[PDB]
Structure 1
């Protein structure tokens, strides 16, 4: 070790594994010092560290002792070299036919357990093929290990071709069989061939109607049924229908193939069909990008953005247009923080023509001006009137029941659907803040609220029922899009506290704390367990009769609400395990009140429990201001985790 000849030292350990003359603590110490040397520099010492560790582990197994942590660390990335060196140390130190049954059984069980810890199955063969492994255990459990480990990751094969009993005796059999293949078909070229032969066999029968599950929008039905050629019309209809159906079932590649085939087909004889199909291809590319290419926060390939910009500035009246394509384009712009274009580069006529573009421009303007104290208001206002006019009723009448007679540029259902297409967090939270500001005019805490006006015009015309529907839907959707969003959990908990769903309110306050803290591992930041939030979970506990929880939650505040804590502790109709939760009370005054409360009621056992709870050196009020704070925060954490278990 002084001279650095570590290989012969590893050989000494291998040989001593036979004799056990070297001390085990000596082996541990040299292993530690070798690892310390490897941690500083001399990267070649990592191999020596594994070698001495493997020898130590094999000896420990022979002496019937546990497997070291470094042994599993070194097999976190199993290698042929590592595992073979371990196996040869295993074989060279076992001393077969003279090791007795103890060494053999221990060492064979170690071989099993090192087989178990391998992520790669071929590693588990090349141990199971090791001679010591085959000699050590038995002649019957090896196949058991191999088969029980094979079904760990068994290979699954599933026929994807739907069965077909295509037994061609009559023409009806053939026509139905080819219809079955076409409907089971997913590739555009096979569809084209099937339709060509179907037209060849028949005289004048169309073939776009051999399946009612194929669907085409009505805005395109007039322009798609006007094709003079029967076969071309049939093929275009089938390609559109199956492309849309594949888009519904998230079969992106097949839909793209069908769409490319129809697109290259329709260029020869129709410009209107070509333009409609370019719009469809743009929509498919947007959806495919957002589904597969997105899902992790990566920018568009900048060519989809150019196509979206061209489609927004298209302005062609002859082409049939789908409002869903424009809505998806606006959502695509809003999700990838393309605020500059929607704010400045958007054409003027598009705002007055498409309400979706106007709403997107307003949202981009109100999101890009957030750092501005007064500049933000100039657009947050206009957004406020446009949204409140959307959620208003002109002239018993209900916005949800009618879905008309609204003063806004969009229906409430259309507004909700458009918001549902947005994933960008800033836009989503701005919409949440706007609708929450609409919720409390005629509470709940949600971020950027002072940027919207308070006084509103035509308060009576505002159907607040539709507004409340929209806000509950939006909070649940946002909690779905980011389950680990603490502020949204606070919003939902405030809602449930307002709706007297005090259990669900407590539960969502706890989710918010588990997000801010790490399941209440840390002190939950006071900006989220505010005095409001903590007092509302207090009130939820009170109204669920979780009164001792009220007491523990009363001290969670900046000032311990001794009034509400003592009021709740006085309650005897409790569903919160009064005596089991006094440990969570770090406050001496609350526990003293508990002592007097239990003494006056004759509860000798509870009085003794509370007295012992006070009689703690850590809870002494004379502690030097650090023991008490640590005890208070640890009781906060453990009480919040008990609430987590009792509520989620």
Structure 2
């Protein structure tokens, strides 16, 4: 408004000729152009000099061409539905469509309650084949005696898992929380199963939204990951992806002190993921050591070359078995693809480059690995080449 008031006092209208008026109106137009906020564009446009100077036909053109710079967009997000309920089957199909479209667990419970109310003995976990519950959970989830409870637990698990797949973490959190608080009453095994699922969902939610800018975990998720790693409960159905993601979570947040020292001994002999994470943390924390690094870099070298070796035409990529390691090569590649920590990634790159250079490529800490290997004939160097190419592609996707 000081600029506009100086503009008003310095023009001397009805005596300023065409030259000053055109220059001054062009200046007002071009200072309207540079305004990032549109309220300032109406602030200049509402001034008497701005209206007086230009025309009565280009002011509207300018204000609409500035309004279209950052337009307000409105869009419907509710999916289409032609719900015109005459017969029982029409109402059943209508409520099944609502159930499949639904993501709020309380609405799902309402729909399932009235669906069991109308029908006699029909199950309703089967009204969509896109609902996938993992096969380790299918037996424990279809053994629920109550029909409505079994249906509701199956639907909540399936929708929570699919929401975690499509990165809908808040809705998955609501669905898993509802399923957990529903199975606290009648099943400790299901309570434990959705505890594990809730932990995995919390890990994914943190690594998607709460991470991504370099801030630490809230230290209760770290305690939960520790407790799940040190769990040792045999009756519960376990998914190996949860333990794999827990080890990846520990590696991604430089929890080398837990992975090297504070890990229980029985976990290393049972889970290959924990053993590999311990070895990676050990070879990462010992990097400023000249010879102490070799003691763990060696063990990482043998375990990785035994992963990438073939026992007994045979190709490691074509067969995926007859490998000597604690892991398949696919599982090792997927586990590394769960890692975003740059030091761990460059350690694995140096390892696989040194393995590839045997039968050159320079990759940082390449001297920490042994050169002479045992069972060189067992190593599928084609598989090593494919692994190092996919690994460098993944790391360049992590940090271009």
Question: Which TM-score band applies after superposition, normalised by the shorter structure?
Answer: over 0.9
Aligned-pair CA distance for 1:173: 1.1
Matches within 5 A, 1:373-388: 373-388=290-305
Deviation track 1:62-89 (CA, whole Å, cap 9, x = no partner) reads xxxxxxxxxxxxxxxxxxxxxx100000
Aligned-pair CA distance for 1:158: 1.2
How far apart are the structure 2 equivalents of 1:164 and 1:325?
A: 38
Does the residue aligned with 1:319 lie in a helix, a strand or coil?
A: coil
Aligned-pair CA distance for 1:170: 1.4
How far apart are the structure 2 equivalents of 1:387 and 1:286?
A: 27
How far apart are the structure 1 equivalents of 2:91 and 2:360?
A: 69
How far apart are the structure 2 equivalents of 1:158 and 1:392?
A: 55
How far apart are the structure 1 equivalents of 2:393 and 2:271?
A: 28
Structure 2 residue corresponding to 1:325, chosen from 212, 220, 242: 242
Matches within 5 A, 1:223-238: 223-238=140-155
Unaligned 5+ runs, structure 2: none
How far apart are the structure 2 equivalents of 1:357 and 1:87?
A: 69
How far apart are the structure 2 equivalents of 1:150 and 1:163?
A: 31
Does the residue aligned with 2:376 lie in a helix, a strand or coil?
A: coil
How far apart are the structure 1 equivalents of 2:314 and 2:44?
A: 77
Aligned-pair CA distance for 1:444: 1.3
Aligned-pair CA distance for 1:168: 0.9
Deviation track 1:420-465 (CA, whole Å, cap 9, x = no partner) reads 0000000000000000010011211110000000000000000111
Deviation track 1:514-549 (CA, whole Å, cap 9, x = no partner) reads xxxxxxxxxxxxxxxxxxxxxxxxxxxxxxxxxxxx
Deviation track 1:121-156 (CA, whole Å, cap 9, x = no partner) reads 000000000111111111101110111111111111
Deviation track 1:22-46 (CA, whole Å, cap 9, x = no partner) reads xxxxxxxxxxxxxxxxxxxxxxxxx
Aligned-pair CA distance for 1:202: 0.6
Residue 347 in structure 1 maps to residue 264 in structure 2: yes
How far apart are the structure 1 equivalents of 2:164 and 2:234?
A: 27
Deviation track 1:157-200 (CA, whole Å, cap 9, x = no partner) reads 11110111101111111111111111110100000000000001
Aligned-pair CA distance for 1:287: 0.2
Aligned-pair CA distance for 1:102: 0.5
Q: Which has the larger radius of gyration?
A: 1
Does the residue aligned with 1:324 lie in a helix, a strand or coil?
A: helix
Deviation track 1:226-275 (CA, whole Å, cap 9, x = no partner) reads 00000000000000000011111111111100011001000000000001
Deviation track 1:576-624 (CA, whole Å, cap 9, x = no partner) reads xxxxxxxxxxxxxxxxxxxxxxxxxxxxxxxxxxxxxxxxxxxxxxx99
How far apart are the structure 2 equivalents of 1:210 and 1:412?
A: 38
Aligned to 2:28: 111
Structure 2 residue corresponding to 1:268, chosen from 139, 160, 185: 185
Deviation track 1:339-368 (CA, whole Å, cap 9, x = no partner) reads 000000000000000000000000000000
Does the residue aligned with 2:377 lie in a helix, a strand or coil?
A: coil
Aligned to 1:401: 318
How far apart are the structure 2 equivalents of 1:446 and 1:103?
A: 67
Aligned to 1:202: 119
Aligned to 1:56: none
How far apart are the structure 1 equivalents of 2:68 and 2:160?
A: 38
When the two chains are superposed, the root-mean-square deviation of aligned CA atoms in Å is: 3.0
Deviation track 1:457-490 (CA, whole Å, cap 9, x = no partner) reads 0000001111111100011111111xxxxxxxxx
Does the residue aligned with 1:209 lie in a helix, a strand or coil?
A: coil
How far apart are the structure 2 equivalents of 1:116 and 1:182?
A: 50
How far apart are the structure 2 equivalents of 1:433 and 1:414?
A: 19
Does the residue aligned with 1:330 lie in a helix, a strand or coil?
A: helix
How far apart are the structure 2 equivalents of 1:240 and 1:207?
A: 14
Aligned-pair CA distance for 1:214: 0.7
Higher RCO (CA < 8 A, seq sep 6+): 2
How far apart are the structure 2 equivalents of 1:249 and 1:442?
A: 42
How far apart are the structure 1 equivalents of 2:86 and 2:113?
A: 21
How far apart are the structure 1 equivalents of 2:97 and 2:16?
A: 71
How far apart are the structure 1 equivalents of 2:113 and 2:86?
A: 21
Deviation track 1:85-119 (CA, whole Å, cap 9, x = no partner) reads 00000011011110000000000000000000111
Q: Which moved more, 1:413-422 or 1:140-149?
A: 140-149
Aligned-pair CA distance for 1:208: 0.3
Matches within 5 A, 1:285-300: 285-300=202-217
How far apart are the structure 2 equivalents of 1:87 and 1:307?
A: 61
Deviation track 1:255-312 (CA, whole Å, cap 9, x = no partner) reads 1000110010000000000011100000000000000001101100000000000000
Does the residue aligned with 2:327 lie in a helix, a strand or coil?
A: coil
Does the residue aligned with 2:322 lie in a helix, a strand or coil?
A: coil
How far apart are the structure 2 equivalents of 1:258 and 1:476?
A: 36
How far apart are the structure 1 equivalents of 2:268 and 2:386?
A: 27
Does the residue aligned with 1:299 lie in a helix, a strand or coil?
A: coil
How far apart are the structure 2 equivalents of 1:480 and 1:221?
A: 36
Instruction: Give the structure-2-normalised TM-score.
Output: 0.99
Does the residue aligned with 1:142 lie in a helix, a strand or coil?
A: helix
How far apart are the structure 1 equivalents of 2:65 and 2:90?
A: 48
Aligned to 1:520: none
How far apart are the structure 1 equivalents of 2:69 and 2:97?
A: 39
